[PDB]
Design a protein around this ligand. Structure first.
Ligand SMILES: [Ca+2]
Ligand SMILES: [Ca+2]
Ligand SMILES: [Ca+2]
Ligand SMILES: [Ca+2]
Ligand SMILES: [Ca+2]
Ligand SMILES: [Ca+2]
Ligand SMILES: [Ca+2]
Ligand SMILES: [Ca+2]
Ligand SMILES: [Ca+2]
Ligand SMILES: [Ca+2]
Lengths: 204, 204, 204, 204, 204
C-alpha cells in the first residue's frame, strides 16, 4: 500500500476505459460508514464520484453528481439526493455517511451539512465489493458508461466503518482526518487501469 | 415532558403518511400567540411548516411556505403573505405572532422583521386542536396531501400564548428562548407516526 | 397633536377604503419643500406613497412608486421619474425636494442622491391641501383606487417649507431630523379612517 | 470665464432644444488631446456625452455612450468602442485621450484603463469647433436628435492639447486636475440655451 | 534583442494583417514547457493568444480562448479545454505548461490552477517554429483568419523549456519571474508586421 499524501489522481480525459481499482479486505457487510474525498472537475454533465458494486448487485453504494449543486447517494439501488449552493468550477470536499439503523444519509459539502435524507433502513451494503474511481460500474467490476465517467482530480479519500460526528468530518475537511479503517489515502492499495496520473495536489 | 434540546425531527422522505402529532391540552381559544421554530429543507415546492386544525375547521392556524422568499400564515381559513430575501437552500429560523385586537401578523425570519399584515381582527382561534408536523391536515388529524408534505428537519419549536416583543424574538433566534406555555421544545409531548427520526441539530 | 416617535402606521391590507388624513394649516402656496419619510412594503405593483390634492387640482403633489428602483414625483399634474439600485423587499428612507425657481426635483434614497430632474419651473403648489397616506386621491379628499393603495408601514414623516441641503437630508436619514413646520412626526395631527394600526417601529 | 468649481450642469429633461455651447478659440488642429469629465445619468438608451463638430465635418470628435458598459469615441467619423464593468445607474468619471502619431485612443473609467483601441493615425482634428453638451450635432452647431439627448448632470469637464500620463488621470479623478488649456471647468466660457440649470455637485 | 519591462504590444484593431513574429533559435524538439503572459482584451468572440506552427504541422502548439471562462491548449493538433470563473472584461495572467512523459497540461489563470487535462503522451513538439502574436496561423507563418485575430494588449511573455512548480508560477504572476530560455520579455527578438504599437503597461 502507498502513501498518497499531498497527491491526487488525475483522470485527464473522457473515456470508457480509464479507472483505478480501490482494494480493501472488506469481509463483513457494512452497517455504517462515512466516506470523505476531495474532487476538482469542470465537467457540467453528471458523473460518478465513487462506485461500489458486489456480486450481482449494481449501485450497492454509489456517490453520484447529478448536476451543479446536487449530490446523490445510492444504497442498494435506492437513492437519495440533497441540494447545496456551490460555485462552478471549484474544488469540492465531500463527506457522506449512512446508518442502517435509522436509514439516515448525511452529506457535508465543504464543511457544510446538507439536509438529511433516509433510505434502506435495516439494510446492509454487502461485502467483497469492486470499488472504482473514474468510472461508474454496471457489472461487478465493469460495464462502464462514457457519459458517467469522471474526468478531473480526486484526492484525500478516506472511508470509515462508523458514522463520524461533525468534529471529525470537520477535521477531514480541514486536512487532518482520523485514520480510516476501510480506505486510507496514506496507506492505499490501488490498481491503475488505463490513463490516470498521480500528480501533486496543488489546488488546496 | 421530553427535552428535545440540541435535537431535531427529520422527515427523511416524501409521503402522505409520515408525521408527528404535537400534544397540548389547550382548552381556551387563542387571542394572542407567538410561534418560533427552525427548519432546514431543500424542497422547491410549497410545503406546510405547522398545521393546527380544530373539529370541523380547516386551516385554523397554518404556517405555509409558498415558495423561496415567501411565507404565509392562515388564521381561521384567512391568509396573509409576506416576502423576504432568502438563500436556497439554507436553514431558517421562523417566528410568527398574531394578535386578535389588531389582527396584526408579524413574521421574523432569521431575526429580520417582515412587513406586518393583518387579518381576522377580533377572532379567537379555537381550542382542542390537532397539531401536526410534516403533513398538512385537511381534516381533524388527517386528510394529508403528498405535495404539501414537509421533508427536512424541524427543531427548537416553542409556542407561547402572548405576542413576544422583539428582544424575546431575538433571544429565541439566538438560542435562549423564554419558557413557553402551549408548546415547549424542552418539555414536549409528541407522537411519531411513520418514518421520522430524532437526530442532533448539527446545522446551527 | 400626537408624538409618533418610534411608531409607524401599518396599513395591513389592500383596500379602497383604509387611509389616514394628515392635517396641516397650509394657507400660503408652496414654492419650496422637502418631504422625508420611511417606508417598508413588499408590494410589487405601483403604489402611492404620499398624495396631496387641492381644490380642483389632482396630483398637485404626488410621490409615487412605479416599480422596484423607480420613484416618481408629480407637481401640478406633471411628473418626473428617477432610478436607483435597490433591494426588494427592503426598508427605504426617501426624501424629495422641489424648487419652483429652477424647477429641480431631488430624490434622496437611503442617503444617496438620484439624478436631478426638472419640472414646473415657476409654478406654485396650491395651499389648503387634502393630504392622504395609504391611498391615491383623484378628487379633493377621495376617489381612491385599490390598485394604487399602499400596503405596508410608514413612519418618520417630516415636511419642511424649504429645500434641505444634503447634511439635513443625512440627519433625517440617520434618525435626527430638523423640526419640520408643515408636517412633523413628533407633533402630528392625523385622522385614521378604516383599518390602520399604530405599532412600534421595529425595523430601523 | 466662470468658475464652475463644485457645480454641475443639469439637463433636467429630455428635449431637442436644451443644450450648452462650450466656447474655445481653438484656431490650430489638434494632434493629441485629453478630455475628462463626470457624468450622472439614469438613461438606459444611448446618448451623446461630448459633441465636437467642425464646418462641414460631422462627428469630428464625439464621445458617445452606446449602452451600459460601452463607450465609443469618434475621430474624424471613424469609430472605436471599449467595454467596462459598471453599475447602473451611477456617477462616472471619464477620460479619453487620443494621439494622432499612434492612433491610440485610451478610455479611463473611474480611474480604470479600458483596452486601448486605434483609429485615424496621422489625422488632425480640425480647429474652430462647435462643442455642445446635452445634444448631439449633425450639423455645425445644430441638427440635434432627441433620442441622443443627454438627460442628467455633467461637471468637472477639462480638455488639454496633450495626452496626460496615468498620474494626471488619477489626479483628475481624485478631484485635483491639471490646469487645462482647451477647456477648463474653473475658467469656462459657455452659453446656456434652453432649460439647463446650474446646481452644486452633491453626488461625488 | 529588446527589453520590454513595463511595456506591452497593443493590437488596436481587428484585421487579418497585424501581427508580431517572435523569433527563438529552438533547435531541439520540446518535451516540457511553460508559457506565461498577461493579456487584456474585450473581444467576446474566440481568439488566438499564442500560435506556434512548424513545417507541415498546423497547431503544433496553440493557446486559444474559446469564450469567456474557457481556455484551450493544442499540442500537435490535439486539443484540451479547461474552464475557470472569470470576470469580463478584465486583465488576465495566464500560464500553461505541458509534460510529454505524462501528457499533463496545467492551466494557471490569475495564479489559480484549473483542472488538469492530458494529451499527446510520448509526443515531442517540433522545433524550428514560426511563432506569432495577434493572429492564428494556418500555414507555416501565414494563412491568418480575421475571426481569430487578437485585438487588445499582450505583455510579460516568458517561455521556459521546463514545467514550472507552483511557486515559480506565482512569482511570475506576482511580477518577478525566473529568467526564461525559450522566450524572455526582457531580451525579446521580434518583428512587427502591420498596425501594432508598443506602449507602457498601465493595467497592472
Ligand atoms: Ca450502475
Ligand atoms: Ca452505468
Ligand atoms: Ca388544510
Ligand atoms: Ca391540504
Ligand atoms: Ca390622482
Ligand atoms: Ca388614482
Ligand atoms: Ca453627429
Ligand atoms: Ca445625430
Ligand atoms: Ca491553425
Ligand atoms: Ca485558422
Amino acid at each position: 500500500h502507498t502513501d498518497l499524501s499531498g497527491k491526487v489522481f488525475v483522470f485527464p480525459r473522457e473515456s470508457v476505459t480509464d479507472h483505478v481499482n480501490l482494494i480493501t479486505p472488506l469481509e463483513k457487510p457494512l452497517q455504517n460508514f462515512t466516506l470523505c474525498f476531495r474532487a476538482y472537475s469542470d465537467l457540467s454533465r453528471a458523473y460518478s464520484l465513487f462506485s461500489y458494486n458486489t456480486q450481482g448487485r449494481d449501485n450497492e453504494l454509489l456517490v453520484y453528481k447529478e448536476r451543479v449543486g446536487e449530490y446523490s447517494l445510492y444504497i442498494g439501488r435506492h437513492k437519495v439526493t440533497s441540494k447545496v449552493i456551490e460555485k462552478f468550477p471549484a474544488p469540492v470536499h465531500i463527506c457522506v455517511s449512512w446508518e442502517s439503523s435509522s436509514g439516515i444519509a448525511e452529506f457535508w459539502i465543504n464543511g457544510t451539512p446538507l439536509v438529511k435524507k433516509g433510505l434502506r433502513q435495516g439494510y446492509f451494503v454487502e461485502a467483497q465489493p469492486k470499488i472504482v474511481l473514474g468510472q461508474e460500474q454496471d457489472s461487478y467490476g465493469g460495464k462502464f458508461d462514457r457519459s458517467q465517467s469522471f474526468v478531473g482530480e480526486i484526492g484525500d479519500l478516506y472511508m470509515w466503518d462508523s458514522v463520524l460526528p461533525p468534529e471529525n468530518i470537520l477535521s477531514a475537511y480541514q486536512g487532518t482526518p482520523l485514520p480510516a479503517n476501510i480506505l486510507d489515502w496514506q496507506a492505499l492499495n490501488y490498481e491503475i487501469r488505463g490513463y490516470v496520473i498521480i500528480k501533486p495536489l496543488v489546488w488546496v
